[PDB]
Every structure is written in C-alpha cells, then in structure tokens.
Paper text:
The armadillo repeat serves as a scaffold for the development of modular peptide-recognition modules. In order to develop such a system, three crystal structures of designed armadillo-repeat proteins with third-generation N-caps (YIII-type), four or five internal repeats (M-type) and second-generation C-caps (AII-type) were determined at 1.8 Å (His-YIIIM4AII), 2.0 Å (His-YIIIM5AII) and 1.95 Å (YIIIM5AII) resolution and compared with those of variants with third-generation C-caps. All constructs are full consensus designs in which the internal repeats have exactly the same sequence, and hence identical conformations of the internal repeats are expected.
The crystal structures of His-YIIIM4AII and His-YIIIM5AII were refined at 1.8 and 2.0 Å resolution, respectively. In both cases the asymmetric units contain tetramers with 222 point symmetry and very similar topologies. The His-YIIIM4AII tetramer contains 16 calcium ions. The coordination number of each calcium ion in His-YIIIM4AII is seven, which agrees very well with the statistical analysis of calcium-coordination geometry in protein and small-molecule complexes. In contrast to many natural calcium-binding sites, where all coordination bonds are approximately equal in length, the His-YIIIM4AII calcium-binding sites are distorted. In His-YIIIM4AII the axial calcium–ligand distances are shorter than the equatorial distances (axial distances 2.1–2.2 Å; equatorial distances 2.4–3.0 Å) and the Glu25 OE2–Ca bonding distances differ significantly from the average coordination bond length. The His-YIIIM4AII tetramer is further stabilized by interactions between the N-terminal His6 tag and the supposed peptide-binding site. Since all four chains of His-YIIIM4AII are very similar (r.m.s.d. of 0.28 Å for residues 14–246) these interactions are equivalent in all four subunits of the crystallographic tetramer. The structures of His-YIIIM4AII and YIIIM5AII represent extreme cases that are most different.
Author numbering: 4 to 250
The structure:
C-alpha cells in the first residue's frame, strides 16, 4: 500500500475511541489497527497520537466487537520495538490482559494470549513486567487445556517469557511449568510435541539451576526418546532442545 501522512487525523481518530457513537468508535478503532499493523514508524505515530490509554480502557468493555479490535490493535503495537512494547506496558495494559486470561470467550482469550506473547517477546524489562503482573499462573494452568488452539498460544507466550534471564526462566519453573511440559512430551499429537519442545528448549537454555530442574522433572528420558521419532521435524526439535540443555 501507500504512504499516508496522518495529520491531526490521527489524534482525532483517537478521540473517537471515547465517542458515545459506536459506529464512529468502531471505524476509528479499525483504522488504528490497520495503521498499527505497519512498521515501527506507523506504530510510533499511533503511540504519539495518544492511542494507548484509550485502547487500554476498551479492554474493560463488555462489547466483544470493540474489545477484539482493541486487542488486535495492542497486539500489533506490541509487535514493534522494545520501547513501543514498553509504552503499552506503561499505559497499564497488563492487568486487563491477565484478567482476560479467565475469559470463557476463546476468541478473546486467544487474542489476549497473543498480545501477551508479543509483549513477552521483548527485552528482559518487558518480560519482567509480564511476570510481575501475575501472568504465570494462568499460563501454566492453560497447559492443561483440551483446546489445542489455546494450548499453542499459551505455549508460545511461555516460550517467550522463558527467553528472558535465568531468574525469569526460574520464575516459569517456580510456577509449575515443567511437569506440564514433560506430560506434554508424551502427547500422541505431534503438533503439540513440537510446540512443547520449543518452549522446553527455551527453558533448558537457562543457567545451571534451570538446567538441573529440567532434569529433575524427567525431561531427559523424553528428549532422548524423541531423538528417534518418525517425524524428522520432531527429531530435529528434540535434538535442538537436548543440545540447548547440555551447554
Ligand atoms: Ca451509542
Ligand atoms: Ca521512526
Ligand atoms: Ca456483549
Ligand atoms: Ca466460550
Ligand atoms: Ca524481541
Ligand atoms: Ca480439543
Ligand atoms: Ca530462587
Ligand atoms: Ca499422532
């Protein structure tokens, strides 16, 4: 598409996020999400127009049509630079995001997990905020989910968190992730095995204390077994995870 210089148009769209006309509101929210899907430059224009605090208030809305679009906007902003991610944090998104991990609406749940995952793909500061906001217990609980679509998104977000510093990995371990991940390594669903290996791999690349807890949990047995799985992608992923574990 096309270069557009957003004038005063962008702060004006932001104002309509507090309009009592939901059709104006939705229109603005749609345009913002489309903007936010561009690069870091487009994202920055949305931040600089003051969109973050208006978006965050919409995360309390009982209107799922508004909420889904606001989440999508925030997830996209969080796909930017670490400071763009921090902006989202600084605007108070995380408490609402964590409380949305309890939604019975799977579409909302997934969007919230996705957004969280994006924020957690940031630097150690951004990951720490996710941890401090109490995301881990819900995340570990979702590893027991029978909804494979939700499971994959929870595994990805955990994986991102476990891409942080050793104490951040330890945080994941202290929340109980290892037993759930080890159980997942016996799934007869190879898609799940791959997703679990990615996450477990990340954990296994922490320091000695994290590497040891990985062994205490029973992962080596499973990893060694999976070295010879029929599926050559799984073989490669179990090999990568085992190699990471042993550095
Ligand atoms: Ca109205
Ligand atoms: Ca720029
Ligand atoms: Ca509703
Ligand atoms: Ca439902
Ligand atoms: Ca990153
Ligand atoms: Ca299912
Ligand atoms: Ca400790
Ligand atoms: Ca199978």
């Amino acid at each position: 598409h096309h270069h557009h210089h957003h004038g005063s148009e962008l702060p004006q769209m932001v104002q309509q996020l507090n309009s009592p006309d939901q059709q104006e509101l939705q229109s603005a929210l749609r345009k913002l999400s489309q903007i936010a899907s561009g690069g870091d430059e487009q994202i920055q224009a949305v931040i600089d127009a003051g969109a973050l605090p208006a978006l965050v208030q919409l995360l309390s809305s009982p209107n799922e049509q508004i909420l889904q679009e606001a989440l999508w906007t925030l997830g996209n902003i969080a796909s930017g630079g670490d400071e763009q991610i921090q902006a989202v944090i600084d605007a108070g998104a995380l408490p609402a995001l964590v409380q949305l991990l309890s939604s019975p609406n799977e579409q909302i749940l997934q969007e919230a997990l996705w957004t969280l995952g994006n924020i957690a793909s940031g630097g150690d500061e951004q990951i720490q905020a996710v941890i401090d906001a109490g995301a881990l217990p819900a995340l570990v609980q979702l590893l027991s989910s029978p909804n494979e679509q939700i499971l994959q998104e929870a595994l990805w977000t955990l994986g991102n968190i476990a891409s942080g510093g050793d104490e951040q990995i330890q945080a994941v371990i202290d929340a109980g992730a290892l037993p759930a991940l080890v159980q997942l390594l016996s799934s007869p669903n190879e898609q799940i095995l791959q997703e679990a290996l990615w996450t477990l791999g990340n954990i296994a690349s922490g320091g000695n204390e994290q590497k040891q807890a990985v062994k205490e949990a029973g992962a080596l047995e499973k990893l060694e077994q999976l070295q010879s799985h029929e599926n050559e992608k799984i073989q490669k992923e179990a090999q990568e995870a085992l190699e990471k574990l042993q550095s």
